[PDB]
Design a protein around this nucleic acid. Structure first.
Length: 142
RNA sequence: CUACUCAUAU
């Protein structure tokens, strides 16, 4: 990285999810991961702040909101999107911003089921965390 | 064994 500039800068980028090509995919679960752990690993590695929401944050479950209590995203009238905030000097705020949005885009391009182990391995640990895991079964055992 | 993941935030 280059040397610091004269003052601290702050900026953010807004990038919508390409879910119009993956209408059966759940990006909010892929970017945040189990218990939000993947959201915390991304924001510490890129040094940028992660933000994700859309019509996936709806509370149509009538007994559930899946977004932890109340929120401030207005009437959630917006589609699935990603936001990435960064703050540094005029010489480093851009390098970290561009690197952070590089990680999100590669997560907006997942693969079909049985070909994307990066989300199947998150679901195994999610199932140890809530205690609902299953060992599965197969015919003609032993 | 692909358990569907909810972390942040004007």
């Amino acid at each position: 990285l280059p040397e610091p500039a004269g003052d601290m800068i702050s900026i953010t980028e807004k990038i919508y999810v390409p879910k119009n090509e993956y209408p059966d995919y759940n990006f909010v679960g892929r970017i945040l991961g189990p218990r939000g752990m993947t959201a915390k690993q991304l924001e510490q590695d890129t040094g940028c702040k992660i933000m994700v929401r859309g019509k996936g944050s709806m509370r149509d479950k009538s007994k559930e909101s899946a977004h932890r209590g109340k929120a401030n995203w207005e009437h959630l009238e917006d589609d699935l999107h990603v936001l990435v905030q960064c703050e540094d000097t005029e010489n480093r705020v851009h390098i970290k911003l561009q690197a952070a949005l590089e990680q999100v885009k590669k997560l907006l391009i997942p693969a079909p089921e049985g070909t994307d182990e990066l989300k199947r391995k998150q679901l195994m640990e999610l199932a140890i965390i809530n205690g609902t895991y299953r060992p599965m079964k197969s015919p003609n055992p032993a």
